Amino acid sequence: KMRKGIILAGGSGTRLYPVTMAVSKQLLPIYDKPMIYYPLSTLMLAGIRDILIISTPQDTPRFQQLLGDGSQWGLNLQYKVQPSPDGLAQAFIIGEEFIGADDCALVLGDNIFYGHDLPKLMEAAVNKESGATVFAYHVNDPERYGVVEFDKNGTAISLEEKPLEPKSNYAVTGLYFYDNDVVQMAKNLKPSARGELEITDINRIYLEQGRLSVALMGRGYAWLDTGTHQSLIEASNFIATIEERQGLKVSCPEEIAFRKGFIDVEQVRKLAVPLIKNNYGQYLYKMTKD
Amino acid sequence: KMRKGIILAGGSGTRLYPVTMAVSKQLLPIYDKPMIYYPLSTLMLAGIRDILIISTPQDTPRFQQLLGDGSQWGLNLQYKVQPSPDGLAQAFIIGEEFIGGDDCALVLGDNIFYGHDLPKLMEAAVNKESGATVFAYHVNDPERYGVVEFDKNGTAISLEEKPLEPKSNYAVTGLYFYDNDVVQMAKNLKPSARGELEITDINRIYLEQGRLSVAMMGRGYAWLDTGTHQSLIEASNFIATIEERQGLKVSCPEEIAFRKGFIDVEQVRKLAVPLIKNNYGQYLYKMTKD
Amino acid sequence: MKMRKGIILAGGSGTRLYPVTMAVSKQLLPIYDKPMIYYPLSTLMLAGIRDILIISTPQDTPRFQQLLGDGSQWGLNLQYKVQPSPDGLAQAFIIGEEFIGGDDCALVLGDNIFYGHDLPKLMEAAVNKESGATVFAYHVNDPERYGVVEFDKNGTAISLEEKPLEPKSNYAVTGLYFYDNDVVQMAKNLKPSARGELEITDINRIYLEQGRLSVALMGRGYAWLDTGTHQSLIEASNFIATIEERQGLKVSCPEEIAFRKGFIDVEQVRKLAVPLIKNNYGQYLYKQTKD
Amino acid sequence: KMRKGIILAGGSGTRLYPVTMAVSKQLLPIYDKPMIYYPLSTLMLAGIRDILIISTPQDTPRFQQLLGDGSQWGLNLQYKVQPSPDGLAQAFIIGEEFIGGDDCALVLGDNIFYGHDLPKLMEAAVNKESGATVFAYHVNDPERYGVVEFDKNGTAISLEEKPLEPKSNYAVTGLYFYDNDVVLMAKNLKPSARGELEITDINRIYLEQGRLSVALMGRGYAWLDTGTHQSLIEASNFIATIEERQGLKVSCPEEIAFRKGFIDVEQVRKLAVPLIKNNYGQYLYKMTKD
């Protein structure tokens, strides 16, 4: 479980009220599984097994009750509280101890990636010795995000957190890879005009040093919107349509743990049975008939 | 004085694992509010204001922080734990002291009704002096529910829980009205068919006494299925389609309390003020204007 | 004594939906399991109207006629007339003059989809009104798209404006209208608006101004499904699918309504189903003869 | 010069009655464009510009009415009728003249493919000099399709058309690529157990010659189902959720021709004119901007 990642799963939850009044947004379903399974799955697909989950004072213990130490899936999971949703970059101040002196990835708890050859897409980022990697994705509402501006060739030259005058239609996704300098940069940030510690500031620091890779995530990939009540419906439908057409599950941690050898046949079987009244447990057991 | 209702909102949620490993089914979002808002709504539209909410040990506290004592919306809410999901009929045993010598309605925490004239459809039931009333609804999969059989003249002649060979296509819905006899009937129920104290055995006792009304819920009403992950997507999409077209909400308790005179403008406004930062409050606040 | 004749206006440019509607007429598009026009047709039937005139474009009108025929298979009588250009809703009544004759009329738009409990009882006063006109008001969130009716402190209709910039309310006028025999001449006496369209809203205002306009409230318990955009099309189809799959019934099945209302008998239905017995629609037709 | 392909857009469409009673299935919308736009886009993306569209006596003239000779898209489109749906392989018998001595692809008119690097997966199959390529895709209901049987090493070893007992969950999709040998093989076919002249039989012949590439289409690709009223809606929601998140269209032919250099900026603006009053024209127009 040598390689490291962080899932930032807290947040004010204000926008979705009152759905999020007694439930962390990141415990909400997306079709047939809790939302956090998706980003967890992404980290696992990047070959990352040592993972810190950050959420609220109220909700962190809920994530721990759900997933425990992660050993049942061949992972090492730990937990820590963010007292207040002070910014994406706080991930790294809170995860200081967890990070030690290693590389680290950060994925937002509500980011849902899907599409062919993702693991390979992430491959260079995971293998990069120094610097950082982020991914850029074309959307119709860039204002909402960190916006990456491109050269008359395809070279990134500027980032902006939520620009009134977006300079491109490319948003930076909520998946990030860093070397070990990120902790110190985070520790040096002052909040922004939005009153947040902005991961955009960190990315610009790496950019200004000429150490930022910005990889393009083409239109062939889905990077699902999860901001509104309506977008949540759409994210679930999308997953449902994939799974029911293929007879396969998207971002199922037990399967991914199995396929990658984190856990064996006897393990899957044991995880499958309590879940076997429905399709989820039956799908997992059947995977095992090898 | 206040009429009395129970919302049974626990269960184990096996059928929805692993979603329900994480969160109470009756806290899953149905578009823009928790599921329990829809059944609460329903009791309210019937004029029932003194409501007991029964959930699990782990979940009750969470329904408590979500809803509070109800005074804010002009209701009186109280709570009780059901240690084990030993059947719908146990609601009356748990609620025996709440109920006293009064009539009581039972609505399932997962029952979503929508349609024109719902309060009229429930009026006879609310005002029945002796006996019980249930509602029948035509489904394509009768075998999953309690099923009511009629004779050629439309008389309820039989009621069978999850029959092998359904005698009709009419299911019994999750809304029930009882006189004060139901408490003693419950206390005598026997773990018949499957480990739970069944609502159909209660109902079967009223039928045999000639005291069960079966009101027909026509096809113009919607009774949203929350049974599977796919049906929960549909419930949500169904509500969203109504609301987005109308610019109005379905089963917004605060709205309803206001339209019925449970609370007045000033209360609505006092509710909205702290919520105006989000779309829900914005909706509350416009209420008090048009 | 008059009867009430029916008109379905299923014309229009269709530009908003290009190029879907370069291949297919909007009102032939599927709403889940049947052509869109089946809905508003079904609405007339539920109101008891069996004699119906369908108006559509020159290009599209023969397609509707391939689909529906003369209506007799469902105990209806359907006729067809062409609207050369989408010059306005109220032209429907100029085009249908020879059809309406001296009777009462009901016009429903080809893309209007109504669903909910006691719909027919909602239309009843309108159907039985002897003189004047009846429209239906529905609270929407984008009133600027429709004719908007303004109500006074007492809830009394007080004005109507077409696609106004500053709506005086959130109540739209529904795409289903009921009229006595006065409407044809009113329509023939209309001058086109600034935007160049013979407006039905100007007809309703006239009736309004005469004191002969009933405006009936279609409550939030009813659904009035949007078909203006591709995205509202998928939602209409998803809305119907969810109803139909939960119930094992069908929304707006002309055959069924004809049967239930006595327009045709069990044998006619079986005669309809046989040829169709290998598809799911036929299977439904046939099961309703059974039990 | 121009590479060739066939779109087989026939069949009764009987199981969709009455939706298909006065419309060809393959003219039904999927979200914002007719169904046939999809597989047409597929061939385009494969570098195939000379295309034969096959359909029924009644529907063929409707396709020719919508698309014309395709030169407004920088293509060559022609048409031919299939009197009766007596087999997919009939495509090559009806298209013998149009094929001549060249390679030919075939795509089914109701097939919708999407995903990251799809053009690359198609370009390998077009590159191929001798033999044939099909694609295998994991699905829920294989018995509806041609089914592939694999080794313990994962080598494709056998094929069966709609097996009662499927040997795997891997179906053959409706996209195929052949060298010029496919026409003689189709001319030698005899009707199978079912009514029909099977493409599966030709594929088996290539497989047994050691000349069939069975290209695996990973679970990251979508291959949407158009077989029921419900699958259509599903395929439309999928497409719509993708386009509205990205502000980009899926399988817009005019866009593909432009991006691939089939047509220039001027020809795009001309295409935009008749569509200019809606989002679809605007999208084409905006691409000649920025």
Ligand SMILES: Cc1cn([C@H]2C[C@H](O)[C@@H](COP(=O)(O)O)O2)c(=O)[nH]c1=O
């Ligand atoms: C701003 C912020 C967001 N979040 C989470 C909530 C979402 O998963 C994600 C994005 O937040 P928003 O969605 O930008 O509030 O990050 C935190 O956990 N802590 C923070 O300080």
Ligand SMILES: Cc1cn([C@H]2C[C@H](O)[C@@H](COP(=O)(O)O)O2)c(=O)[nH]c1=O
């Ligand atoms: C270039 C282009 C690709 N596509 C589709 C084809 C493939 O399904 C997908 C390829 O995306 P990709 O760059 O991420 O591989 O996008 C279009 O629909 N329109 C276009 O103009």
Ligand SMILES: Cc1cn([C@H]2C[C@H](O)[C@@H](COP(=O)(O)O)O2)c(=O)[nH]c1=O
């Ligand atoms: C059986 C049972 C269900 N419930 C709630 C959850 C279910 O959605 C609903 C009906 O349960 P059911 O699955 O047996 O029909 O009632 C309880 O709160 N306690 C119970 O003992």
Ligand SMILES: Cc1cn([C@H]2C[C@H](O)[C@@H](COP(=O)(O)O)O2)c(=O)[nH]c1=O
């Ligand atoms: C009788 C009948 C009604 N309807 C519709 C009209 C209304 O929208 C709704 C009325 O349902 P209701 O029985 O609850 O009043 O059902 C059909 O779609 N098919 C039918 O066969």
Ligand SMILES: Cc1cn([C@H]2C[C@H](O)[C@@H](COP(=O)(O)O)O2)c(=O)[nH]c1=O
């Ligand atoms: C203006 C007009 C609209 N229509 C149809 C097209 C639309 O479906 C509907 C509403 O038109 P608008 O809504 O006035 O464009 O009525 C015609 O059939 N004829 C007409 O002259």
Ligand SMILES: Cc1cn([C@H]2C[C@H](O)[C@@H](COP(=O)(O)O)O2)c(=O)[nH]c1=O
């Ligand atoms: C009175 C009231 C009803 N409702 C719901 C209950 C019904 O299912 C629906 C139909 O109303 P109608 O009976 O006015 O059509 O509206 C609210 O959501 N809020 C309210 O204030």
Ligand SMILES: Cc1cn([C@H]2C[C@H](O)[C@@H](COP(=O)(O)O)O2)c(=O)[nH]c1=O
């Ligand atoms: C058998 C056959 C199918 N088709 C079309 C109809 C369907 O869209 C598709 C697949 O049909 P299938 O499952 O029966 O093979 O091919 C033809 O156009 N011609 C034919 O000869």
Ligand SMILES: Cc1cn([C@H]2C[C@H](O)[C@@H](COP(=O)(O)O)O2)c(=O)[nH]c1=O
């Ligand atoms: C191995 C594995 C992949 N995936 C996902 C990750 C990517 O989104 C996509 C990659 O598919 P691919 O095989 O076509 O490249 O599939 C799962 O959801 N579960 C799994 O067990």
